[PDB]
Design a protein around this ligand. Sequence first.
Ligand SMILES: O=P(O)(O)O[C@H]1[C@H](OP(=O)(O)O)[C@@H](OP(=O)(O)O)[C@H](OP(=O)(O)O)[C@@H](OP(=O)(O)O)[C@H]1OP(=O)(O)O
Ligand SMILES: O=P(O)(O)O[C@H]1[C@H](OP(=O)(O)O)[C@@H](OP(=O)(O)O)[C@H](OP(=O)(O)O)[C@@H](OP(=O)(O)O)[C@H]1OP(=O)(O)O
Lengths: 283, 288
Amino acid sequence: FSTPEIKKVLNSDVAINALLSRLKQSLLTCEEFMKFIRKKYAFEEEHVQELSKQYKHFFNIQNSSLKKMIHEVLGFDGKMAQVKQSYITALQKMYSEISSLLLTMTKLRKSVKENSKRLEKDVSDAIHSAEKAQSRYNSLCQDWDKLRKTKLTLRGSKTTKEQEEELLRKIDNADLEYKQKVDHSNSLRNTFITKERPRIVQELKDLILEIDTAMTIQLQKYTIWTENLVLNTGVTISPLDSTKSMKSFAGSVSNERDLYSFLNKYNQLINKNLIPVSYKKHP
Amino acid sequence: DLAHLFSTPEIKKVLNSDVAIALLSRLKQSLLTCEEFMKFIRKKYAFEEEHVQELSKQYKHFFNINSSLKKMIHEVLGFDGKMAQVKQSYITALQKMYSEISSLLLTMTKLRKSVKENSKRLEKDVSDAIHSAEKAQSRYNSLCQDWDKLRMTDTKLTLRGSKTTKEQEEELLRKIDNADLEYKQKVDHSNSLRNTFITKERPRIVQELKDLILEIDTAMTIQLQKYTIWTENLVLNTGVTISPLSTKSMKSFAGSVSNERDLYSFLNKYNSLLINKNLIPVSYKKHP
Ligand SMILES: O=P(O)(O)O[C@H]1[C@H](OP(=O)(O)O)[C@@H](OP(=O)(O)O)[C@H](OP(=O)(O)O)[C@@H](OP(=O)(O)O)[C@H]1OP(=O)(O)O
Ligand SMILES: O=P(O)(O)O[C@H]1[C@H](OP(=O)(O)O)[C@@H](OP(=O)(O)O)[C@H](OP(=O)(O)O)[C@@H](OP(=O)(O)O)[C@H]1OP(=O)(O)O
């Protein structure tokens, strides 16, 4: 946390590009997680839908124990589905949230990067202009230096004198623009290095940490949602109140009693021919 | 208490008319219960199969790869994988159950067919005997009618030899005696067959049908319980999958993340170093 090393590296040039790249990576993690969650909640939603639909067929009709018990365990199926529905709802909510996040953060990063590029460019090209002017100045001065040696004469005439004077004026002007452009460039540069740069990298750091922490929280949420789902279905099938368990329903059937019911019911008939033949004569 | 089927209404019900042999229908109903259940669990393991497939396929389809997060997400997706595995096991169990119930249904159907046909056949035999008796009766009564109509005639007719009323009388008397013996015989035959059917065979048939019904239904109930334990196993196993009996749980992964530390690593890692040629400052130095 703000070590001499970290503070040392944060002061260099590559920093501003580096943590931009980092932030980009973070954005990518976000988008990735979005996609995953979407696919997940999609097919899970599918699962729920069929789960809920399918059990409502079969034995849905309203007189026997077994059929009833089956009806009930299919009911359990339904309950499970409702739980999972709650879960997918949670997932959807999450997705929307992290989407909004990603949007905001991408936009923000774009802005910061633009600003950075602009400022840095301004400084750099200012320096460029300065060093150009420098080159000019040094060139003219180099010629004037070339003036002053294995040479002949020359007292010269009005022409050479005029050339000298003119060149001196030229060098004077070039010198002034040189100096002022240098001071300008250095001013801008130092203003950038001392104030703007650390502010930008500060902002980018803050952003990265923000989005990272948010997403990690989101991951933890996904986790607790999942284990919530699993646990609750787990306690849905086996509520710890045994009378509500699935095995509880499946346990109580008694077919013999239902058969006795069938027959004893049939008691409360049918001739079917097979009436015997009687023998009697008539003399 | 057992011997509920040994009660008065029950015994008189089964010992009653063909209404007993109701049991065929009931066995049919149980068979339809079987088939319906099959249909259901078929649909079930179908869409569960779909779910599992998509689970595994989708889980494996993303990261596959350096910060903490990437790792952690990779892990929780791994957990998704484990879940897919256990649910696959569950599906396998379901399919097995399907096969078993199917075989059961087959057996029971074949048996029902056989028994029913047998019953029908024996009943038919009885009915045929009765019919024969009725025929003999008709013949006898007819010939008696002929006699009683004949003795209203006062004269001789020529046929075999020739004449007469008296001889015709005696002849017809002989005929009717024969027809009468036939009658009595076939009556006794009929009634004997009937009694033997009612007292011996029919009970055995009823017994068999009842036994079959209880067999299939009990079997299907234990099957239901099997399905229940299968589901319990599934959910319990996914449960213990995502939270093992450890430091390698899901909450453990999701909980433990670097963020600040590995960012410090990321920065301190940059330490030769790229310095910008565009931002080299410029100095002003004059010239003599
Ligand atoms: O077209 P490319 O050669 O593949 O380069 C692009 C481009 O970067 P440059 O402008 O420096 O060439 C994008 O910049 P923009 O068009 O959006 O202004 C930049 O996007 P970011 O500035 O938002 O980072 C993107 O990077 P990324 O793929 O992380 O989005 C990067 O692609 P490369 O990193 O593969 O070079
Ligand atoms: O009890 P099952 O062994 O399954 O046989 C029944 C029975 O036929 P049988 O009396 O010849 O044994 C039905 O007859 P009823 O009880 O209605 O008098 C008949 O119904 P239909 O006479 O109306 O055709 C039905 O046939 P289906 O399933 O087409 O309705 C047929 O079942 P099977 O064709 O499977 O033998």
